[PDB]
Amino acid sequence: SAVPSDSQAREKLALYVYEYLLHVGAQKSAQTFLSEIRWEKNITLGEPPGFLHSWWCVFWDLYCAAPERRETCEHSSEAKAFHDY
């Protein structure tokens, strides 16, 4: 609902970075993070690689779209197609 507060966004980012650390193979850092920030709520996570990883990777893919860099850095074709067409 409504607009996320800065607190809510920081919390969602923290949990999704925890899930990222888990799926990237950083269990030690995952729990060191969980209490270096004093997390107290019950966790549940989705399939690997996780929310943050998947969305970030399609972002960086769309990053090499027709405007600016385009064909200068390796990139997908489906992304450039999502941009141009």
Partner: protein, 219 residues
Amino acid sequence: GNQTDYRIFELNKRLQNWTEECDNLWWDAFTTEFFEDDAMLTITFCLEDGPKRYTIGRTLIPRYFRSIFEGGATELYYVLKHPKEAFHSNFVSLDCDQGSMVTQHGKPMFTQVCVEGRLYLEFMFDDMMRIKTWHFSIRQHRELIPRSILAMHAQDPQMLDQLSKNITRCGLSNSTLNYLRLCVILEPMQELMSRHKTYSLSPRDCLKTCLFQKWQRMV
């Protein structure tokens, strides 16, 4: 320009209430008071390689205003000299060739950057005369430094030609430049997100199925 001039006045007046503690909810309330739910904002400049144009929708608008402050500004206001008003069936245009976006920078080095350009606004012609479209084509800009701080660092040459440099590239701080660059690419993804929010699929499969679709819109 008795109806619309006043709206820009109220915009400035509210921007006088900003504090460092103003967060996402405050900027959302501000935007909601001055912008329609489907309003569109556009900045345009020249920079160093060629003309640039950035257009963002309503939800990305608050952070646009916030970006200017989080780059060093402590107050913001617009000056419109001789704007042209035009009433229409369903909206009111305000077109100002001599538009100025002025920002004061806080402690330290209390500098003022004045960005000149053409401001074109379309307001809706109803009780809450909110902005439907905002278009700022930036031409030149100035950065003015207090003659107080010139005397201070006047006998510190290696440091002080540092103050012959420039805070902003185009009148826009790096904060706003990077924000609008990120908007360019994250905003069309919003449809994918909706796909994600509804059909359960991978973000890459969302991208795939949307791209997959959009050739047929064209026929």
